[PDB]
Amino acid sequence: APVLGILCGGGPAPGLNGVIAGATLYALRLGWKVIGFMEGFKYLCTGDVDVVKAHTIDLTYDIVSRIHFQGGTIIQTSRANPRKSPELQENVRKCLRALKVRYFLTIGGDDTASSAVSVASGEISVISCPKTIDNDLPLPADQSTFGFHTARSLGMEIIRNLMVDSKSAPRWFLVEAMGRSAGHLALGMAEASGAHLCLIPEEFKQDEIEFEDVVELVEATILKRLAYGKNYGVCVLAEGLVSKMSKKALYKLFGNREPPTDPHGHILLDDAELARSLSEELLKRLGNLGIRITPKKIGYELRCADPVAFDAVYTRELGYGAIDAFLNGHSAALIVRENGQVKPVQFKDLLDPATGRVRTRLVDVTSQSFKVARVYMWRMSKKDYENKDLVARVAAAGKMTPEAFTEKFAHLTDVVVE
Amino acid sequence: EAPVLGILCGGGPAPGLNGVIAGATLYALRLGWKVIGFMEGFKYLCTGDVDVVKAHTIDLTYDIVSRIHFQGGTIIQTSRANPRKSPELQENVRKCLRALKVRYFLTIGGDDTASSAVSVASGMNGNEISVISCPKTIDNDLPLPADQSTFGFHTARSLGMEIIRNLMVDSKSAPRWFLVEAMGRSAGHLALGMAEASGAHLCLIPEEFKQDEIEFEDVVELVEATILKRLAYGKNYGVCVLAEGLVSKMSKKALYKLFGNREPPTDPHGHILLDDAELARSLSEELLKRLGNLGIRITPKKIGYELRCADPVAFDAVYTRELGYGAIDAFLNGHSAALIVRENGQVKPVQFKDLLDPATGRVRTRLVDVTSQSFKVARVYMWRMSKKDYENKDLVARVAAAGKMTPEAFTEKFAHLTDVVVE
Amino acid sequence: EAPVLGILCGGGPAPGLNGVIAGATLYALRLGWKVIGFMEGFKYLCTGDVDVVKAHTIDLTYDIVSRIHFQGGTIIQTSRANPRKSPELQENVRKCLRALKVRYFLTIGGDDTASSAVSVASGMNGNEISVISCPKTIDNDLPLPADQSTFGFHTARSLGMEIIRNLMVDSKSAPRWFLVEAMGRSAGHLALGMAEASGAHLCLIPEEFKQDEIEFEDVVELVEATILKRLAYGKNYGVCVLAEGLVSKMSKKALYKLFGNREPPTDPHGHILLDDAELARSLSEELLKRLGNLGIRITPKKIGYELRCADPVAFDAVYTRELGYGAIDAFLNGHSAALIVRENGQVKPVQFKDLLDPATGRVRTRLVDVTSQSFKVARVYMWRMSKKDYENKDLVARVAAAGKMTPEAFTEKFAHLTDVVVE
Amino acid sequence: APVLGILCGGGPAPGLNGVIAGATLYALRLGWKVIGFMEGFKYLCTGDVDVVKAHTIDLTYDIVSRIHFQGGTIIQTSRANPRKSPELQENVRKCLRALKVRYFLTIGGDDTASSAVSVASGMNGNEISVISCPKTIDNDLPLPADQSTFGFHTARSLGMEIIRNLMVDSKSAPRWFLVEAMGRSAGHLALGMAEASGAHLCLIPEEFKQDEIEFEDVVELVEATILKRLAYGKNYGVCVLAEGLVSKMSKKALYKLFGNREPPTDLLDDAELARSLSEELLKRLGNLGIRITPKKIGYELRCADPVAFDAVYTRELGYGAIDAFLNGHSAALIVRENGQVKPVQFKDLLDPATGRVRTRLVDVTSQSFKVARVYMWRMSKKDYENKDLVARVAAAGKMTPEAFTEKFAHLTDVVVE
Ligand SMILES: Nc1ncnc2c1ncn2[C@@H]1O[C@H](COP(=O)(O)O)[C@@H](O)[C@H]1O
Ligand SMILES: Nc1ncnc2c1ncn2[C@@H]1O[C@H](COP(=O)(O)O)[C@@H](O)[C@H]1O
Ligand SMILES: Nc1ncnc2c1ncn2[C@@H]1O[C@H](COP(=O)(O)O)[C@@H](O)[C@H]1O
Ligand SMILES: Nc1ncnc2c1ncn2[C@@H]1O[C@H](COP(=O)(O)O)[C@@H](O)[C@H]1O
Ligand SMILES: O=P(O)(O)OC[C@H]1O[C@](O)(COP(=O)(O)O)[C@@H](O)[C@@H]1O
Ligand SMILES: O=P(O)(O)OC[C@H]1O[C@](O)(COP(=O)(O)O)[C@@H](O)[C@@H]1O
Ligand SMILES: O=P(O)(O)OC[C@H]1O[C@](O)(COP(=O)(O)O)[C@@H](O)[C@@H]1O
Ligand SMILES: O=P(O)(O)OC[C@H]1O[C@](O)(COP(=O)(O)O)[C@@H](O)[C@@H]1O
């Protein structure tokens, strides 16, 4: 019988088990043998077939019949990446040939998909399922990556508790939403929860963000709320703001120190604490006004939540579509769903010609959806800065003259799209 | 004086009603409008007494709505009071709207609500009042582009998945079959959504039956075939979800058996009272007679009103926010006698005529597309006997053995089901 | 060879069974013990066939139990199979336990499960096998100390509170009365727990009725008086919680009316089939006749099986972890024929015979203490007519007018209810 | 009719609205007029009756009839404290007399109760009667053992759910999470979450024998657990740390905690216990393939909707506060003991050494604490004497058995066993 091998790569997302169960159950009805590689490509990269065998399990009906209820992944995951070295690429092929895998399904994000194709270019069929809580794969605009609905809904619930706490005990929370690729998750939680402000890298006009601009954008929102009798709120910040910051901005971000670096010289953005740094600066400027500021991260607690019904149906249909692609002879394709139809889409169609890697889908800040979400935020627009009565009220809330306020804040209209 | 926006809700509640109310109100307050809300839909506007209406209208202020997007239900309540039947009531509604100087009138409800709003507007000048309605249904039965949901449906489906999950664990921990009856007779979107998400072993919706009228025996045998096939694989437990809409497709003879071989209950006007029907209960009793000897236990369970006012999930909070905004945008752009709908990621007004089915005079009913790939995928992960299964002599031998009958008897009784439901 | 601990579950499932199983297994594994679990309680141990028992026993390993403390249900399932009625079955259980060389035998279940365990032990040498039982019930009807709840009760009550919360929002958003029927016929602990937490406008439990037999009319009138009093304050909606145990206290005449003026159903051996009774449904039908004209709509709703396998709340996660440890502690300390209970924050074994009520021979049943401060406080936040309320003529006039009847007529019909339930 | 005034002080806890609704609904049935002061004592301290009126609301049946479902407090809360100045105390006295408050209910912590009694001690006992309801999510009131403060049950169960997701994520993507449970008073909340979720280790200040904790000891305690699980093939886990560990640390330990810098001063809030431990442990164990990430579980618990246990608890408390007033009680705290809500004079609950209500901490000698410790991964005294176990654990850390015993064995004298 043909052998289907399944692995997960990247960060976990709710519904991984849904894909594994959808593909495996259907594959078992066809008589296929199904196996699962533990921790993604980590052991397939070694090239040692003995080690790989110690880290594969037989995916049986009893194993998968009820994992569609469960967050996380029963075969675990890793970011082990064979595409970096041709030596590692041949190791992955050597172990797959040794195990006589006829069909190879990888469940992961953009990094995982690019890894799959390198193994595929040289019998064996390679298909990948789109996974990310950041929603940054190049799916059709009216289509989400699986795990995003679950992550967004749980993020909304957490932010609701912070909204009740901020009003009950007046305070501002700076929530730092995990994910640096795009702002889909940060904007999603903020819009659903009615958060008073959301900042994503996609809305900054210039290529490089300055630390002062970010501080002042949050400051303007806090003051305008203060002019309307509200000394509390919630502000959501995409962690991706850090990856757009200039060299100078990162220096201030890390405490006016040199940014930490890995052995190769790349900055270590994980050590950055965007929300905590902004909270300290803002307390210095606004504490006297009766404002309290506390940072809060909404990250890893979203990744392995049990899937919501939308992701349960999505991943069941995706797992089926992966098997159907195998039966119909497809290879080097991504299973995507558009207009209620799961279809394979060749890898090449999704590559960005400039990069050679899977294209990254960001928030379209020109869309109607972004404009409606922006309406329900507290912020100063171009028209607001031109309203002399409004500028007077806000400036007074910040205990500064209107001329001082316009000098400091009016330039932000050229920093972010309006 | 600032323009007055009046908002009411009609029909049954759906999660996210407060989302529409807050979305419309908050944007309107930023424009300087005065916003008021009628309690219980048209109930008091039908009286025509302006004294009574004011006692049951409230000022929808920033403080009232700034945080109702978290909450299920509707803070201005709802009713099915329907003025369209009488112009005495319609003119009473007109008299109160004019007294309160309502410039913009937003109704959130089903067709009965939408039709009432347009009828009240037709006997009014277009300059004086502009009328917009937002279509609401938890049944997902509006004619949106395929695989695009009505607001409130996602929340109802996800909560239904959670309830069925607890029943799936309970059926396995203490072997038993649950017949879950999903509320709603319009369509089978909700029953199928819960079933697919929870991995339920069977779902029956009226949309999959080929013939125009369903027979009570066939429904029993379709569930019976699933229970036997599961029993033949060592599983004497499961969960089967039944859309309540099965009752509305049943023949006269089928309804006679459904109500205990009695005459179906009737209202004063003579129309059948299908609400008194207990589909899951009757099927459970009959199946216990046939399968009790095999060690099978069967219990019914309804999943209804606990879904209607659950707090909205993030998808519905965003959905209703865009709808509330889009209605105000429609008012600003001069639209009236229009329905605020979201299609292809865009909230737009849609004239009533485009959505009406001429046969009924009400909005067309979108049912489950049983030819769609989604329905076929859902059917794959169910336990059932297909055309190919009945031709498999080895499989038929095991299932018949589980039912303590010969293979010939089983094929004779059940094989005809392949002509009853699409395959 | 290491000693063998064998575990089974009996009775109905309750949240935290996996918690007890994981507590006992993990600690037992650290001691070097071998742990096995019998599937479906006593079902296969009663056969006496060691081949059948082995086909339905599993090895409880670290990987199997390391994280089941999060999960509702039981990984080894449960059953109500009861060997205690027959010595033939008791000896069969002994034969299979000796064959599997069970040194320690832990049963997790209710009264019947504990009683079966002791009977199996009386004909067994105290040096070969030691038997311990862990008390489980969602009905909270075991005779634990008054300051202690049974495990699973906290989870069932909190989820029950949430479901009723959605019904409270739905009843107010769309004016209606829900008659919620709380599962469990032993006592009213679960119904009163859900009602008080959710602010339900009324709770009726068997424990509050003075007379030994309840009358169907009295139940209808108690709900009728509440609906009218609420109506006298402008509220035509609410939620009323009914312990299913009301049915098991009803007289013969009351049961005849309960089953539709039909003969009550009976099983083959003569036991009335109270499961088939639908208390909330029947009360709704009668109340709609009397109160429909007033604009009152009534709908029943059952809150049953969806609570039994919910994931445990933290209180039950800690409780069942301490119980599983406490069962292992009892085994190590030479205890047998004892039940592991927690009192004043201390887990200790308590001999089964010490917990028996000498008048009956069974474990005493703890019901709601209606004289306690807790019950009086719960009654305060209900809508009802007290003794003094019936004497307040201003109030009685307002309520009677809401009911379309004279004040004298109201007193005639309802005033006697102060002699039906404790005040 | 008599006037009952209610205010909230301190940090919010789930069920605050439950107390407000219990007291208000019962008082309305008695015919009382009920008002609520916004943000605790903040505006009563000014003494301006015009300002206070702008920040008091009429607590009516419609306002409170359904707030028992809701987290937070509808009248908000503050830490404004009039007891510090006799000038502020008059101001509170002047505004309460102006509003003709007969009954005064304060819902808050120890500071809130002390303010209420202080305002009452210099006021005629006939005009005003004062009761306080003790609130804390830290479970540190001196109730009978194994009896909780309201809000603790809700906070613990939601914290369990958060940790569960981290437990799945740590296993799905091998990693260690150092969760820092908010609260410096005690370890009730950290240990409650840890036991319920099956977390592999929990550290509370109460388990350290010496009076001052050393930063090195904390690192090594977490290090030993990571190695012992690693010796059983598991390079992942979750460890819960009570924030109270920092307030027990020595001066030298705090110096290392803040990055070998001078600790900030007016400041334990600025300390990042979980983050600092994460950095040090990565230095020592990163080479072994271990990743460590901190996570704080704080403010998201404070205003969660109450669980059923807290909804009943706060309803019974609100009833008891009204019952105490009717029976003439004043300068008393409404507490529940043996399932009975009754008033207890504030002075009866004070520990003479401090002048504030006594603090109940985790009893590490109790059976409950030992059972929780059993299901943790750690090296006991007996474990260090098991040569086979020490050899495997040391090998997992790529160090000799002698080196492992040299570095870690002394920890059995650092924490109770
Ligand atoms: N930036 C903003 N975002 C959302 N609402 C706002 C904003 N600024 C003012 N509002 C609200 O808009 C309404 C009208 O404000 P105004 O134009 O100042 O009278 C009030 O309800 C304000 O709270
Ligand atoms: N009706 C069904 N729906 C879903 N899975 C099934 C069904 N019938 C059999 N299976 C599974 O399909 C696989 C192959 O079955 P078989 O045809 O007996 O080899 C096994 O894992 C069965 O449990
Ligand atoms: N049976 C009841 N349970 C709870 N609250 C009530 C009840 N009856 C009246 N109330 C409330 O008690 C307050 C005073 O009642 P009354 O003095 O009768 O108007 C009002 O808020 C009523 O809604
Ligand atoms: N520190 C610990 N905490 C909890 N369980 C443990 C610990 N150490 C060992 N175990 C478990 O105890 C059982 C017996 O261990 P061993 O004595 O090493 O065979 C196995 O299930 C281990 O995983
Ligand atoms: O697993 P790590 O290395 O700690 O990184 C977490 C990152 O993974 C994510 O959770 C999602 O990972 P993917 O991009 O692979 O879906 C991001 O939000 C986050 O930046
Ligand atoms: O409110 P009623 O009269 O009891 O009717 C219940 C109906 O409301 C619903 O739950 C939802 O109604 P809507 O489509 O108007 O949202 C239906 O499923 C059901 O038919
Ligand atoms: O398993 P069955 O026969 O459906 O019985 C359901 C009964 O079990 C329970 O859920 C609990 O039963 P136990 O007391 O044995 O735990 C009751 O509430 C209910 O009456
Ligand atoms: O409100 P702050 O100043 O940010 O401090 C939060 C503190 O309040 C609490 O949530 C509890 O407050 P109380 O002690 O008043 O009950 C602690 O857990 C926490 O240390």
Q: Compute the C-alpha angle B54/B55/B60, nearest 5°.
A: 70
Does B314 contact A192 at a Cβ distance shorter than 8 Å? yes
Q: Which of C354, C307, C331 is nearest to C140 (CA)?
A: C307
Are B192 and B180 a contacting pair, CB within 8 Å?
Answer: no
The DSSP call for residue A204 is B
What is the H or E stretch that residue B4 is in? strand B4-9
Distance CA A113, CA D79 (A): 53
Q: What are the structure tokens assigned to A417, written together?
A: 């799209």
- What are the backbone dihedrals phi and psi of residue C388, each rounded to the nearest 5 degrees, phi first? -65, -35
Chain D residues in contact with A303 by the CB 8 A cut-off are: 165, 169, 172-173
Distance CA A165, CA A186 (A): 20
A299 touches chain D (CB under 8 A): yes
Half-sphere exposure of B81 (CA within 13 A, CB side): 22
Compute the residue count for chain A: 418
Burial of A162 (C-beta count, 10 Å sphere; 0-12/13-18/19+):
buried
Q: After which residues is chain A broken (C to N over 2.5 A)?
A: 122
Distances (CA, A) of C362 to A88, B188, C116, C147, C355: 70, 50, 12, 22, 8
A172-177 sheet: strands from edge to edge: A197-199, A233-238, A172-177, A293-298
**CA B68 distance to own-chain centroid:** 23
Are A18 and A116 a contacting pair, CB within 8 Å?
Answer: no
Distance CA A38, CA B51 (A): 72
D176-181 sheet: strands from edge to edge: D201-203, D237-242, D176-181, D292-297
Question: A61 in ligand 2 pocket by Cβ < 6 Å?
Answer: yes
Distance CA C20, CA C23 (A): 5
Distances (CA, A) of A125 to A38, A53, A138, A343, B335: 19, 20, 22, 16, 54
C298-303 sheet: strands from edge to edge: C202-204, C238-243, C177-182, C298-303
Burial of B267 (C-beta count, 10 Å sphere; 0-12/13-18/19+):
exposed
Distance CA A56, CA A38 (A): 6
Q: What are the structure tokens assigned to A217, written together?
A: 């954008």
Does B170 contact C73 at a Cβ distance shorter than 8 Å? yes
Method: X-ray
- Ordered domains of chain B (ranges, CATH): 4-146+312-355 (3.40.50.450), 158-308+385-419 (3.40.50.460)
Q: b/e map of A256-295 (b: 16 or more CB within 10 Å)?
A: eeebeeeeeeebebeebbbbbbbbebbeebbeeeebbbbb
> Chains near D, with 3+ CB pairs < 8 A?
A, C
Pairing of strands A341-346, A333-338: antiparallel
Q: What are the structure tokens assigned to D66, written together?
A: 């359904």
Which amino acid, one-letter code, is at D82? P
Tokens 């200790």 map to which residue? Answer: C348
Q: b/e map of C409-420 (b: 16 or more CB within 10 Å)?
A: ebbeebeebbeb
Q: Compute the C-alpha angle A268/A273/A274, nearest 5°.
A: 110
Distance CA A88, CA A78 (A): 15
Chain A residues in contact with D16 by the CB 8 A cut-off are: 168
Residue in chain B lying closest to A314 (CA): B197
- What are the backbone dihedrals phi and psi of residue B391, each rounded to the nearest 5 degrees, phi first? -85, -15
Distance CA A187, CA A172 (A): 18
Q: Is D104 helix (H, G, I), strand (E, B) or coil?
A: strand
Compute the residue count for chain B: 423
Distance CA B109, CA A301 (A): 37
* Rg (alpha carbons) of chain C, rounded to whole number: 24
Helices (H), D65-123: 86-98, 110-121
Neighbours of D144 (CB within 10 A): 13
Nearest alpha carbon, ligand 8 atom 1:
D11
Burial of B248 (C-beta count, 10 Å sphere; 0-12/13-18/19+):
middle
Q: Which of D177, D115, D174 is nearest to D346 (CA)?
A: D115
Distance CA C177, CA C396 (A): 22
Q: Which of A209, A218, A264, A216 is nearest to A240 (CA)?
A: A209
Does D299 contact A78 at a Cβ distance shorter than 8 Å? no
Compute the residue count for chain C: 423
**CA A171 distance to own-chain centroid:** 27
**What sign results for the dihedral spanned by CA atoms C314, C315, C317, C318?**
positive
Q: What are the structure tokens assigned to C269, written together?
A: 């051996």
Crossing angle for the helix pair C87-99 and C111-122, nearest 10 degrees?
A: 70
Are D290 and D226 a contacting pair, CB within 8 Å?
Answer: yes
Which amino acid, one-letter code, is at C394? D
- What are the backbone dihedrals phi and psi of residue C200, each rounded to the nearest 5 degrees, phi first? -60, 145
Distance CA A206, CA A216 (A): 16
Beta bridge partners of B131: B105
- What are the backbone dihedrals phi and psi of residue D168, each rounded to the nearest 5 degrees, phi first? -65, -45
Tokens 């028996």 map to which residue? Answer: C356
Distance CA A186, CA A200 (A): 7
Tokens 């279809």 map to which residue? Answer: A343
Q: Compute the C-alpha angle B78/B80/B83, nearest 5°.
A: 115
Q: Is A123 helix (H, G, I), strand (E, B) or coil?
A: coil
Q: Which of D166, D180, D150, D187 is nearest to D310 (CA)?
A: D150
Contacts of B211 (CB under 8 A, 6+ apart): B420
Q: Compute the C-alpha angle A120/A123/A129, nearest 5°.
A: 45
Crossing angle for the helix pair D188-197 and C314-332, nearest 10 degrees?
A: 70
Which amino acid, one-letter code, is at C110? G
D282 touches chain A (CB under 8 A): no
**CA D296 distance to own-chain centroid:** 14
What totals of helices (H) and strands (E) does chain A contain, helices first? 16, 11
- What are the backbone dihedrals phi and psi of residue C148, each rounded to the nearest 5 degrees, phi first? -140, 135
The DSSP call for residue A357 is S
Nearest alpha carbon, ligand 8 atom 20:
D183
Answer left, alpha or beta for residue B379, where phi above 0 means left and psi between -120 and 50 means alpha: alpha
Q: Which of A155, A159, A163, A131 is nearest to A145 (CA)?
A: A131
Q: What are the structure tokens assigned to A265, written together?
A: 């010289």
Q: What are the structure tokens assigned to A99, written together?
A: 């195990």
Distance CA C101, CA C4 (A): 7
Q: b/e map of A109-148 (b: 16 or more CB within 10 Å)?
A: bbbbbbbbbbbbeeebbbbbbbbbbbbbbbbeeebbbbbb
Contacts of C252 (CB under 8 A, 6+ apart): none
Q: Compute the C-alpha angle B164/B169/B174, nearest 5°.
A: 125
Answer left, alpha or beta for residue B295, where phi above 0 means left and psi between -120 and 50 means alpha: left
Beta bridge partners of B239: B178
Which amino acid, one-letter code, is at C99? A
Distance in Å, alpha carbon of B163 to nearest chain C alpha carbon? 6
Distance CA C318, CA B419 (A): 55
Neighbours of B379 (CB within 10 A): 19
Q: Which of D91, D71, D78, D75 is nearest to D5 (CA)?
A: D75
The DSSP call for residue A201 is G
Active site residue C139: yes
Distance CA D295, CA B65 (A): 34
Q: Which of D137, D145, D126 is nearest to D11 (CA)?
A: D137
Which amino acid, one-letter code, is at A252? K
Which amino acid, one-letter code, is at C377? V
Distance CA C153, CA C149 (A): 7
From the CA of C394, which ligand is nearest?
3
Annotate D349-360 with DSSP letters as a single string: HB-TTTSSBPPP
Q: b/e map of C338-355 (b: 16 or more CB within 10 Å)?
A: bbbbbeebebbbbebeeb
Burial of A352 (C-beta count, 10 Å sphere; 0-12/13-18/19+):
exposed
In angstroms, this model's resolution equals 2.8
The DSSP call for residue B196 is H
Q: What are the structure tokens assigned to A46, written together?
A: 């070694």
Distance CA B283, CA B298 (A): 9
First-residue to last-residue Cα distance in chain B: 64
Distance CA D14, CA D155 (A): 7
Distance CA B59, CA B37 (A): 6
Distance CA A132, CA A358 (A): 13
Burial of D348 (C-beta count, 10 Å sphere; 0-12/13-18/19+):
exposed
> Chains near A, with 3+ CB pairs < 8 A?
B, D
Are A315 and A71 a contacting pair, CB within 8 Å?
Answer: no
Q: Which of A351, A320, A336, A324 is nearest to A121 (CA)?
A: A351
Report B:318-357 residues touching A (Cβ under 8 A).
318, 321-322, 325, 344-347
Distance CA C379, CA C384 (A): 9
Distance CA A15, CA A151 (A): 11
Pairing of strands A125-130, A103-108: parallel
Burial of D414 (C-beta count, 10 Å sphere; 0-12/13-18/19+):
middle
Q: What are the structure tokens assigned to A15, written together?
A: 């519904």
Are B140 and B366 a contacting pair, CB within 8 Å?
Answer: yes
Distances (CA, A) of A181 to A52, A210, B172, B317: 31, 18, 42, 24
Are B237 and B165 a contacting pair, CB within 8 Å?
Answer: no
**Ligand 8 centroid – CA C159 distance (Å):** 28
First-residue to last-residue Cα distance in chain A: 59
Distance CA A122, CA B103 (A): 69
Annotate A265-321 with DSSP letters as a single string: S-B-GGG--HHHHHHHHHHHHHGGGT--EEEEEE-GGGTTPPPPHHHHHHHHHHHHH
Contacts of B418 (CB under 8 A, 6+ apart): B386, B387, B390
Are A175 and A234 a contacting pair, CB within 8 Å?
Answer: yes
Q: Which of B240, B161, B382 is nearest to A25 (CA)?
A: B382
The DSSP call for residue D99 is T
Longest alpha-carbon distance in chain D: 80
Distance CA A335, CA A350 (A): 12
Pairing of strands A172-177, A233-238: parallel
- What are the backbone dihedrals phi and psi of residue D379, each rounded to the nearest 5 degrees, phi first? -100, 115
Q: What are the structure tokens assigned to C83, written together?
A: 């060997």
Q: What are the structure tokens assigned to A384, written together?
A: 């607001």
Does C314 contact D153 at a Cβ distance shorter than 8 Å? yes
The DSSP call for residue A330 is -
Are B325 and B23 a contacting pair, CB within 8 Å?
Answer: yes
C299 touches chain B (CB under 8 A): yes
Distances (CA, A) of B120 to B9, B45, B127, B132, B364: 15, 11, 14, 12, 22
Q: Which of D155, D162, D80 is nearest to A169 (CA)?
A: D80
- What are the backbone dihedrals phi and psi of residue D337, each rounded to the nearest 5 degrees, phi first? -140, 135
Q: What are the structure tokens assigned to A30, written together?
A: 């066809």
From the CA of B62, which ligand is nearest?
1
**CA A132 distance to own-chain centroid:** 6
Neighbours of A328 (CB within 10 A): 8
Does D11 contact A169 at a Cβ distance shorter than 8 Å? yes
First-residue to last-residue Cα distance in chain D: 60
Q: Compute the C-alpha angle C350/C355/C358, nearest 5°.
A: 150
Which residue among D48, D138, D270, D351 is the active-site one? D138
Beta bridge partners of C242: C181, C204
B301 touches chain C (CB under 8 A): yes
Q: Compute the C-alpha angle D142/D147/D149, nearest 5°.
A: 70
Half-sphere exposure of D241 (CA within 13 A, CB side): 24
Are D40 and D6 a contacting pair, CB within 8 Å?
Answer: no
Tokens 């740390």 map to which residue? Answer: D241
Half-sphere exposure of C188 (CA within 13 A, CB side): 24
